[PDB]
Amino acid sequence: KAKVSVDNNPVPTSFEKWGKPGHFDRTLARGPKTTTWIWNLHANAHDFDSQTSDLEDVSRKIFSAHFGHLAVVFVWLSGMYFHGAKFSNYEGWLADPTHIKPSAQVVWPIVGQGILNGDVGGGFHGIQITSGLFYLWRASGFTDSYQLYCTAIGGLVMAALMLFAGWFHYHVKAPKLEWFQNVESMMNHHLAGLLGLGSLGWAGHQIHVSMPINKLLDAGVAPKDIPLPHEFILEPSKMAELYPSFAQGLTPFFTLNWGVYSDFLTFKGGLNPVTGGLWLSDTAHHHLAIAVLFIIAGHMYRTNWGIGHSMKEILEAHKGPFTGEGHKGLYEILTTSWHAQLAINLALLGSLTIIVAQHMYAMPPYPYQAIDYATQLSLFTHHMWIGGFLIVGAGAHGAIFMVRDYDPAKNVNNLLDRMLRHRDAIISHLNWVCIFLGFHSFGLYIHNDTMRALGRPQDMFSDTAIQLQPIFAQWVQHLHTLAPGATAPNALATASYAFGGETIAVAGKVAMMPITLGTADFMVHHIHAFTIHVTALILLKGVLYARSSRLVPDKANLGFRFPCDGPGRGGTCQVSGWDHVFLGLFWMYNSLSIVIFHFSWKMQSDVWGTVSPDGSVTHVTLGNFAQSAITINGWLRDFLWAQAANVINSYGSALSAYGIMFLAGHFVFAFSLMFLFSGRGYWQELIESIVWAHNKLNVAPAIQPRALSIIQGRAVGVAHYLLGGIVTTWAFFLARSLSIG
């Protein structure tokens, strides 16, 4: 009695196809003749759409591969827990969190890398970790290493479970296509049974486990004396003496007398003075409310009892005068093409990751996270880079869909057709706005640079000169500062002190203080706007013009990934959507680099620092952002050269592994230029000569070596370029943040 419909044993389990690489592709099946057959093999592997024309088989492969990635992630998580249980000082750090550096990686002394095992405090030697696992574990009610070990074992078991699930759900019982297309039931289950249920379970964990342990920990109780979490459940009087409302049981819940639970379900806001993190009661009510909302939302779409809206009806009913058919036809697009779903989900997930990175730093949830500047910087930059990559992937796979799965017959005068019919106006207006933003933002920096260089500081765009005050941002900051008073009366303090208010400081360091905005903030925010609009321009031009263009009228027949159309028409290099993605990757890199640089410098200059017992705050870089970040020379001198001392002078210490890596970052970048600046004809001729050489000695290979294809050359260049640049920035940031106390 279900919509379940599966096929039994569609693909037998055998090992023969393991010994025949390239089995999936007919082009690579017959065997290698040149070295290109190798590079194709690793490139067309996980492209199930090209291998077969069956939507059902493609969907089954996707389901199984998703199980595999889940198993891999589970293995990674279990490994993190194991290495934090056995090779970490978490038990030592828990007793003295304000004097001992977190550390979970220990190095074998073999060729002198034992110097990397620097002292992290408390007599423990190891690599300091900035992933923030210790703060998460403390907020999760971890006190003993055995609990972490048990978590790691459970993670390994669950990874094995996911692997077996993939094997069963593909090689044995594979769901039918109609099962995959129950989008209404799928959203119902994932909105209610996954997000709502998961958030409710976490709220239960936090209330019944995390609150008592953290309440004891912040009150000065030793970690070795705090009762085990199950003791609170087995002895409810222990829970009741910590929170009096627990003495009333569950009666106030079912009677809607919810105010009884006000003692441990609060709306405090702000941060915990003891630890610098958010209140756990705030997070408990938050995750409980989130669970309630998602469980309510999960019942919207009708599945099997005719109660609920139908997605197709909603899509077909929203249509206005300017759009003709409106949103009609999108439901068939999104229920028959995986690439459109991948594009939308990638864009939303990348934006969500950027939101996560932007919202964590301003209000640190985990205890002592704000006091650890290195952890803040690392987490912010990491999740920002992840989000940027995901957005670029959305821009790529959308163009893939447009090239492959777009059908003009079923998209007559709908929203997609009117996308393709006024795209030229879109691209022209977007190009104009990109140029205008670039001029009226970067020319401000250049004008300031020239005015400073000419000895005319009074003609600059500075707070002591012509001022560009972000009045709207300051006004919204003032509004959010006044929110606890009347606009949100039941809130004790502000959502985050970044908007304004008091300076929350833990131990001798600043946890969070108001972040004022001046001329420099205005200029940098508009620079961010310019870079983002340019990246959007590149990716949107790639998606819109993927099918064809004025230059090439049958581009879609060439495919998504082709190098060029030849030197005709004056030259047609990089006209495919793939080349648009390749070009947009660089611009995403530039934008995210500027974003992380701005965050790091502003946090170091106007937020982080130390608090004297008198109450005065001494920032890390003495507040030089407002006067130096208005010129490019300021960025060069007071940020790069100034803050690169801690990484260049890292030799002979525990931080030397960063300095090495720093230089490593400066290398691969340069190396990548030897793929991006050149072409494959020269390398092919050089390979011809080298092949003659190896032929003279009768040692020529049977597999004829060939230079990399144009697309592969571009991919290798961009990959090594991004690797080098990102590694450079990572080493620089880590070595700087681990040395500013």
Partner 1 sequence: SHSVKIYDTCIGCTQCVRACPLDVLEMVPWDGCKAAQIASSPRTEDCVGCKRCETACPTDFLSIRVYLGAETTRSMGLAY
Partner 2 sequence: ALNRGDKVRIKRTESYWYGDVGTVASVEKSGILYPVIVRFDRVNYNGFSGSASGVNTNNFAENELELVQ
Partner 3 sequence: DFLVHHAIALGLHTTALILIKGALDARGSKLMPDKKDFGYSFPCDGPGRGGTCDISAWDAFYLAMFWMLNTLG
Ligand X SMILES: CC1=C(/C=C/C(C)=C/C=C/C(C)=C\C=C\C=C(C)\C=C\C=C(C)\C=C\C2=C[C@H](C)[C@H](O)CC2(C)C)C(C)(C)C[C@@H](O)C1
Ligand Y SMILES: CCCCCCCCCCCCCCCC(=O)OC[C@H](COP(=O)(O)OC[C@@H](O)CO)OC(=O)CCCCCCCCCCCCCCC
Per-residue binding string, partner 1, 541-560, x by CB under 8 A, is: ---------xx--x------
Q: Which residue is nearest to ligand SF4 (CB)?
A: 564
Q: Let me know: does 603 contact 377? Beta carbons within 8 Å.
A: yes
**Sign of torsion over alpha carbons 244, 248, 252, 254:** positive
**566 touches, from ligand SF4, ligand Y, ligand PQN, none (C-beta below 5 to 8 Å by class):** ligand SF4
Q: Let me know: does 398 contact 340? Beta carbons within 8 Å.
A: yes
**Per-position b or e across 705-714, b if 16+ CB within 10 A of its CB:** ebbbebbbbb
Element (H, E) at 84: helix 55-86
Site for ligand CLA in 181-200 (CB under 6 A): 182, 185-186, 189-190, 193-194, 200
| Amino acid in the structure at residue 386 | I
- Examine residue 112 and tell whether it contacts ligand SF4 (CB under 6 A): no
Question: Which tokens go with 287?
Answer: 């995750």
Least CB distance from residue 43 to ligand PQN, whole Å?
Answer: 13
Choices 426-434, 566-574, 586-594, 604-612; region in contact with partner 1 by CB under 8 A: 566-574
Question: Which tokens go with 11?
Answer: 């693909």
Please name the residues in contact with 60: beta carbons below 8 A apart, sequence gap of 6 or more: 10, 170, 174, 175
Q: Which of 4, 5, 23, 34 contacts partner 2 by CB under 8 A?
A: 34
Least CB distance from residue 559 to partner 1, whole Å?
Answer: 14
Q: Phi, psi at residue 9, to the nearest 5°?
A: 50, 65
CA distances for 196 relative to 184, 202, 299, 346, angstroms: 16, 10, 11, 22
Per-residue binding string, ligand Y, 321-360, x by CB under 6 A, is: xxx--xx---------------------------------
Q: Phi, psi at residue 125, to the nearest 5°?
A: -115, 125
CA distance 2 to 632: 64
Q: Let me know: does 731 contact 665? Beta carbons within 8 Å.
A: yes
- Examine residue 318 and tell whether it contacts ligand Y (CB under 6 A): yes
CA distance 284 to 210: 10
- Examine residue 685 and tell whether it contacts partner 3 (CB under 8 A): yes
Q: Which of 321, 689, 696, 698 contacts partner 3 by CB under 8 A?
A: 689
List strand residue ranges (DSSP E) for 543-665, in order.
Answer: 609-611, 617-619
674 labelled ligand-binding: yes
Element (H, E) at 29: helix 26-29
- Examine residue 13 and tell whether it contacts partner 3 (CB under 8 A): no
Q: Which of 567, 613, 615, 652 contacts partner 1 by CB under 8 A?
A: 567
- Examine residue 425 and tell whether it contacts ligand Y (CB under 6 A): no
**For 638, which DSSP code?**
I
- What is the dihedral angle through the alpha carbons of 269, 271, 274, 279, rounded to the nearest 10 degrees? 50
Site for ligand X in 676-715 (CB under 6 A): 697, 699
Angle at the Cα of 550 from the Cα atoms of 544 and 551, rounded to 5 degrees: 105
CA distance 103 to 120: 7
Q: Let me know: does 639 contact 698? Beta carbons within 8 Å.
A: no
Per-residue binding string, ligand PQN, 619-658, x by CB under 6 A, is: ----------------------------------------
**688 touches, from partner 3, ligand PQN, ligand SF4, none (C-beta below 5 to 8 Å by class):** partner 3
Element (H, E) at 104: strand 103-105
Choices 107-115, 116-124, 309-317, 682-690; region in contact with partner 3 by CB under 8 A: 682-690
CA distance 370 to 379: 11
- What is the dihedral angle through the alpha carbons of 46, 51, 57, 59, rounded to the nearest 10 degrees? 40
318 labelled ligand-binding: no
666 labelled ligand-binding: yes
Per-residue binding string, ligand PQN, 706-725, x by CB under 6 A, is: -xx----x------------
Site for partner 2 in 550-589 (CB under 8 A): 562-563
Please name the residues in contact with 636: beta carbons below 8 A apart, sequence gap of 6 or more: none
CA distance 639 to 643: 6
- Closest by CA to 368, choosing from 608, 603, 136, 92, is 136
Cβ distance to ligand CLA smaller for residue 276 or 395? 395
* Sheet with 609-611, side-by-side order of all strands: 504-506, 509-512, 609-611, 617-619
Question: Which tokens go with 3?
Answer: 């919509």
Question: 519-544 vs 577-602: helix axis angle to the nearest 10?
Answer: 170
How many of the other CB atoms lie within 10 Å of CB of 58? 19
- Examine residue 109 and tell whether it contacts ligand PQN (CB under 6 A): no
Choices 36-44, 264-272, 529-537, 719-727; region in contact with partner 2 by CB under 8 A: 36-44
Q: Which of 680, 700, 704, 719 contacts ligand PQN by CB under 6 A?
A: 680
CA distance 574 to 586: 15
Please name the residues in contact with 116: beta carbons below 8 A apart, sequence gap of 6 or more: 107, 127, 654, 656, 657
Q: Which of 10, 21, 204, 470 contacts ligand CLA by CB under 6 A?
A: 204
Choices 367-375, 632-640, 658-666, 677-685; region in contact with ligand PQN by CB under 6 A: 677-685
Helix, strand or coil for residue 317? helix
Site for partner 2 in 649-688 (CB under 8 A): 684
564 labelled ligand-binding: yes
- Examine residue 573 and tell whether it contacts ligand SF4 (CB under 6 A): yes
Least CB distance from residue 324 to partner 1, whole Å?
Answer: 27
**697 touches, from ligand CLA, ligand PQN, ligand X, none (C-beta below 5 to 8 Å by class):** ligand X
**360 touches, from partner 2, partner 3, ligand CLA, none (C-beta below 5 to 8 Å by class):** none
Binding site for ligand CLA (CB under 6 A): 42-43, 45-47, 49, 63, 66-67, 70, 180, 182, 185-186, 189-190, 193-194, 200-201, 203-204, 207-208, 233, 236, 239, 246, 249-250, 253, 261, 288, 342, 389-390, 392-393, 396-397, 400, 560-561, 578, 581, 667, 670-671, 673-674, 677-678, 686, 719
Binding site for ligand Y (CB under 6 A): 318-323, 326-327
Binding site for partner 1 (CB under 8 A): 550-551, 554, 565-570, 572
Binding site for partner 3 (CB under 8 A): 562-568, 571, 677-682, 684-686, 688-689, 706-707, 709-710, 713
Binding site for partner 2 (CB under 8 A): 27-28, 32-34, 36-37, 40, 562-563, 684, 704, 706, 709-712
Binding site for ligand SF4 (CB under 6 A): 563-564, 566-567, 571-573, 679, 710
Binding site for ligand X (CB under 6 A): 697, 699
Binding site for ligand PQN (CB under 6 A): 674-675, 678-680, 683, 707-708, 713
